[PDB]
Amino acid sequence: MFEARLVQGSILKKVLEALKDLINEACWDISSSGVNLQSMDSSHVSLVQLTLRSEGFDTYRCDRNLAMGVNLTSMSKILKCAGNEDIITLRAEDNADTLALVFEAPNQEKVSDYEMKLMDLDVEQLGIPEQEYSCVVKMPSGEFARICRDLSHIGDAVVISCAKDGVKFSASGELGNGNIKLSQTSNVDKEEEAVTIEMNEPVQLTFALRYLNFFTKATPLSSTVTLSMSADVPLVVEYKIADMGHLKYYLAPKI
Amino acid sequence: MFEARLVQGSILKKVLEALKDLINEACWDISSSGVNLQSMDSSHVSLVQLTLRSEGFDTYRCDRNLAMGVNLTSMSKILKCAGNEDIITLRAEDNADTLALVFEAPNQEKVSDYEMKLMDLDVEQLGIPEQEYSCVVKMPSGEFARICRDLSHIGDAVVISCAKDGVKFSASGELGNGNIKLSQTSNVDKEEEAVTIEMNEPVQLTFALRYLNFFTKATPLSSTVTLSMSADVPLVVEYKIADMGHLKYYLAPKI
Amino acid sequence: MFEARLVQGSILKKVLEALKDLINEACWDISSSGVNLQSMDSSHVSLVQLTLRSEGFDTYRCDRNLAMGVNLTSMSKILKCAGNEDIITLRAEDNADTLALVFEAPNQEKVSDYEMKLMDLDVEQLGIPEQEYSCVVKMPSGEFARICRDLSHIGDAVVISCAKDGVKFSASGELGNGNIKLSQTSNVDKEEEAVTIEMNEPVQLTFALRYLNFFTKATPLSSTVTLSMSADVPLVVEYKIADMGHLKYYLAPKI
């Protein structure tokens, strides 16, 4: 038996809401150390890596490594039947072709029990080259979402320029161009309002806005986001999942 | 002649919003004891029965029993035009076949006078007698609304199974299957957000989920809903209309 | 050079919201006396005329009259990017391309520099010249908005009847008919409905409700609206924008 009881159900709701548009199907690599997902998106452009560590779960049980192939659109639909404050328990027999999802209200008067059909899929594998990056921008998650959205009216691509004297997002198109300059803070007082740049050398990279606008569906999961960049390698957009792990999205620059 | 004055016109806005999707035209039986509507949907699976007592109105007079044929699409349109806190007055002179509806804004600035056909058409008048039911379930209306909404993502039918210690709703379909068990809870005193059962013998019936989703548009009219059920007879779904009367939806099971 | 600055970002946004569904490509006349926009809408039915005097901006400089051809949907989008508390700067250097729109958030965290390509359109004019009208009605803007919206459920045309009593809007279609009567009560009254009317002779004209429902998108720009009517000429619906300027709509009555 695999069995994982997650007390804050909102978290799994949000993860599915952040993945279902970008990718339709993917295998859930389950083990004693946690749950891990790794997939390309459905247009073969970006890469996604999800991690939810075992200890994040209130109760956790994994007799042996499972791989469950999963339609995320169906999984999301089922999770929309969960409340935000439900305790969600995930359960699969060792080689069973189903995943049960139990949504307990907090007072135990209402209990729901769903049994999802798996789909049978060939796993993907990479993980990408772990790297020391030139720039790391930490910033509010709501601010990053709004920027990508604003600039998507102007252009299909965004140039992210970092230097010592700031970060800048620029886009360009048929109706013109725009530049959004977001200043580092010093003493912001809260921690989650900070804009901090860890800079080694200036960098200027171009990314497809369409894909960044997918990545920002993870905003509910965290109040900050970090962007790690270096020349000619994929951007990582990282959202922390409430002490349990993370959702990274990798994207090639143009060129 | 007919005239009924209702100071809390918000109630009548809620009833028409409850009726307009399911039923398109209906007979309005007006008498000195009040308003009684009764109709099948255009597909013959369900029946609605509405009752508004004369004493529920601020003023009421009926000279003359009347069977006004009414287009509920058109009446819901006109009611849209009413303020939330307008006084609503319904009116019919005699050998005129028109229903007038007068909305007087809260601080007598503005009177709106509306009038609609009153197409007296070949119709019905059933009733169907008092039955004794195997189960009667009372529960919060918003909770029944939620279970019908969520299960409609899974299948197009719901098995309702009643038992001493609770009621279950189960559905099955494309993306897998689902059951929601609500427990009898007692409490009472501080609120009736309870789930109570009255069980002479257990019941187990399948119903059309889309119809139950029409019925739940009445959710805003009452904090609770009752479900009376028996083998082979139509389910009743009752909503109380704040000390003026009731709204009952009737649905026959399958097989 | 042209340059204008405003603290009231919001007003600009509301002007574009109120124009952009009626007209696509527009020509802004920028002179030293201010900004002027005059155009038919894209169906050649109604006429719009916007005026924003130079004094209404808290800085204003214009060396040379410019005719800046803009797509109003694209400019509404851009202005959607700005904080409602943002300081806005409009800037152009004289012709081809660049209108620059700069949004500076209140305390210096964020600056947004946009640049809109201008197309070459001729500066229109015609400026149909003023008149004394049989009848001039002034009323709450949100009440005028609500009357057009509601009657649009009954009919496609409204008949405005002005009289010493007050003003009456009446519409008629398939479902039946409706009239709304606002009366002149005296003075010193709490209700915000002091509908006032300056009158030479009762008028009675019909108007397409589709277009009136375009003109009420200006509702946020002012709390009152003034209607000016005579037989055989266009209605004028005027929103005064706070001694900054005005937005006028012209619609001819049905024959």
Numbering used by the authors:
A (entry chain C), B (entry chain A), C (entry chain B): 1 to 255
Text lifted from the article:
Monoubiquitination of PCNA represents the key signal for the switch between high-fidelity and specialized DNA polymerases to bypass a variety of DNA lesions at stalled replication sites. As a first step towards understanding the Ub-PCNA/Pol η interaction, we used EM of single particles to determine the three-dimensional (3D) structure of the native Ub-PCNA in complex with full-length Pol η and DNA. A molecular model of the Ub-PCNA/Pol η/DNA ternary complex was constructed by rigid-body fitting of crystal structures into the EM map. The structure mapped the location of the C-terminal domain of Pol η, elucidated the mode of interaction of the DNA with the complex, and captured the conformation of the ubiquitin competent for binding to Pol η.
PCNA is a DNA sliding clamp with a pivotal role in replication. Not only does it regulate the activities of both replicative and TLS polymerases, it also acts as a scaffold to recruit various cellular proteins involved in DNA repair and cell cycle regulation. The crystal structure of the PCNA, which forms a toroidal trimer with pseudo six-fold symmetry, could be unambiguously fitted into the map in a distinct location. PCNA instead of Ub-PCNA was used initially for fitting, considering the multiple conformations of the conjugated ubiquitins on PCNA adopted in existing atomic structures. Cross-correlation coefficient was used to distinguish the current fit from the one obtained by 60° rotation of the crystal structure of PCNA along its pseudo six-fold axis. The reliability of the fit was further supported by the agreement between the identified positions of the ubiquitins from the map (described below) and their expected positions when covalently attached to PCNA in the current orientation through the Lys-164 linkage. Consistent with the presence of DNA in the complex, the central hole of PCNA is partially occluded by a conspicuous density, reminiscent of the DNA passing through the ring. Importantly, this density adheres asymmetrically to the inside of the PCNA ring when the map is rendered at a slightly higher density threshold, implying a non-uniform interaction of the DNA with the PCNA ring. Intriguingly, our model suggests that the DNA backbone interacts asymmetrically with the central hole of PCNA, only forming stable contact with one of the PCNA monomers. Furthermore, the DNA transverses the plane of the PCNA ring at an oblique angle of ~13°.
